[PDB]
Design a protein around this ligand. Structure first.
Ligand SMILES: *[C@@H]1O[C@H](CO)[C@@H](O[C@@H]2O[C@H](CO)[C@@H](O)[C@H](O)[C@H]2NC(C)=O)[C@H](O)[C@H]1NC(C)=O
Ligand code: CA
Ligand code: CA
Length: 278
């Protein structure tokens, strides 16, 4: 009902990255101290309904619609890996291909949106993408040097805290956490700053160009490198399992070309100040 609401992320200093990297190729290390000015972050990833308001207002055609295909995980059917298929007619309204629909999942995160699509939405909304540092600071939710937004245990108190994979990937997803594919954007507990599904569910685009080479120097509101070929995405998705993936940590990070899209990748917006009410 308020799926475009923002929360205030307080000013602070935090440790970005980790000196105990789990996927070393991704440049999770070194840990570095980063200062972040107070700003606002969407509580929820952008949902199908919210994206549809944007498309209704602007007529925007997404990159996947213009290309005529997008990547779909083979386990969702009725490339980076054999389980990623380029499906003709897969896009945000048709997340598994032309015979699928979003009618029954209006409150789920929008998928098959490229980095350019995400920038278009956020700017239409009076907002912007978060930087990687803003995203990671917000993900950590006021905790220092923890694996997850909520701490170091995957299932605190025996409860699922995010939508990831259980079972044997890619053949069997048991749905133990309540969701095979995506969950509603307001599912699961919030983190300490009031964000929902910051890890898991679907990946989220950030504004930074990708590099794996980071300095240990302290920085203020860093924006990432001035050039690159891929943009950074964060958080992991409903596909992720410890056995092959382990990217549902705040420090984890991956990348895609900005015209890329997939069935497990969306976004949320940020803003320096609140945009106009309504
Ligand atoms: C986006 O626009 C469509 C088309 O105007 C909206 O769907 C219509 O909503 C009205 C109002 O309830 C109905 O009378 C029509 O039958 C709907 N048409 C179709 C084709 O669904 C839709 O609700 C808008 N989406 C958002 C999120 O506002
Ligand atoms: Ca799940
Ligand atoms: Ca997420």
């Amino acid at each position: 009902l308020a799926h475009s609401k923002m929360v205030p992320i307080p000013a602070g200093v935090f440790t970005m990255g980790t000196d105990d990297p789990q996927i070393k190729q991704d440049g999770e290390a070194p840990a570095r101290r980063v200062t972040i000015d107070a700003f606002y972050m969407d509580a929820y990833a952008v949902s199908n309904t919210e994206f549809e308001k944007f498309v209704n207002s602007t007529g925007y055609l997404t990159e996947a619609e213009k290309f005529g295909d997008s990547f779909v995980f083979e386990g969702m059917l009725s490339a980076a890996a054999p389980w990623w298929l380029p499906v003709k007619g897969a896009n945000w309204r048709h997340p598994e291909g032309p015979d699928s629909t979003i009618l029954h999942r209006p409150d789920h995160p929008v998928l098959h949106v490229s980095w350019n699509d995400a920038v278009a939405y956020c700017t239409w909304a009076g907002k912007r993408l978060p930087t990687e540092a803003e995203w990671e600071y917000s993900c950590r939710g006021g905790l220092h040097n923890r694996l997850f937004p909520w701490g170091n245990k995957l299932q605190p108190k025996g409860q699922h805290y995010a939508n990831i994979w259980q079972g044997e990937f890619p053949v069997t997803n048991t749905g133990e956490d309540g969701f095979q594919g995506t969950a509603p954007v307001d599912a699961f507990p919030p983190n300490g700053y009031g964000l929902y599904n910051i890890v898991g569910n679907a990946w989220e685009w950030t504004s930074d160009w990708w590099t794996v080479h980071h300095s240990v120097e302290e920085t203020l509101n860093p924006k990432g490198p001035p050039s690159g070929k891929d943009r950074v995405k964060k958080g992991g998705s409903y596909m992720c399992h410890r056995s092959y993936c382990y990217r549902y940590r705040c420090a984890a990070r991956s990348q895609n070309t900005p015209d890329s899209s997939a069935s497990n990748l969306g976004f949320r917006c940020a803003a320096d100040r609140l945009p106009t009410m309504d």
